[PDB]
Amino acid sequence: YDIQAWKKQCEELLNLIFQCEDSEPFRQPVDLLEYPDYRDIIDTPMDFATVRETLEAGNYESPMELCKDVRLIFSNSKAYTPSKRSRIYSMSLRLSAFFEEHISSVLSDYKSALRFHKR
């Protein structure tokens, strides 16, 4: 019932994601010099360094907001990919499965703790 615990749980999970080779494409923003059409396709860039900085700045109120930005990393990869068999997109799908496997308990515990708080 700790309604703050999600923040360190997310820091920990971001540390695991940064250790994961599959996060290599989405640590930093897309260099628009290497992908000159990126912003023609993607309205809202997102990456894991931006998510970590937002968290560490105290600019997430809940793990749902962090989850929305991480999911945007993955949806951007899916929107930008020329092929469902692309290397970078394939890395996104594995990393997404990993993230969803790990974030589920963080969301559940937070929502449970908030419900207890508001009982």
Q: Does 77 bind ligand Y2J (CB under 6 A)?
A: yes
Residue 81 binds to ligand Y2J (criterion: CB under 6 A): yes
Q: Which of 6, 26, 60, 99 binds ligand Y2J (CB under 6 A)?
A: 26
Contact (CB, 8 A) for 6 and 62? yes
Task: List the structure tokens of 35.
Answer: 């992908």
68: helix, coil or strand?
helix
What separation, in Å, do the N-terminal and C-terminal C-alpha atoms of the chain show? 12
Is residue 45 close enough to count as binding ligand Y2J by CB under 6 A? no
Residues in contact with ligand Y2J by CB under 6 A are 24-26, 28, 30-31, 34-35, 77, 80-81, 86, 88-89, 92
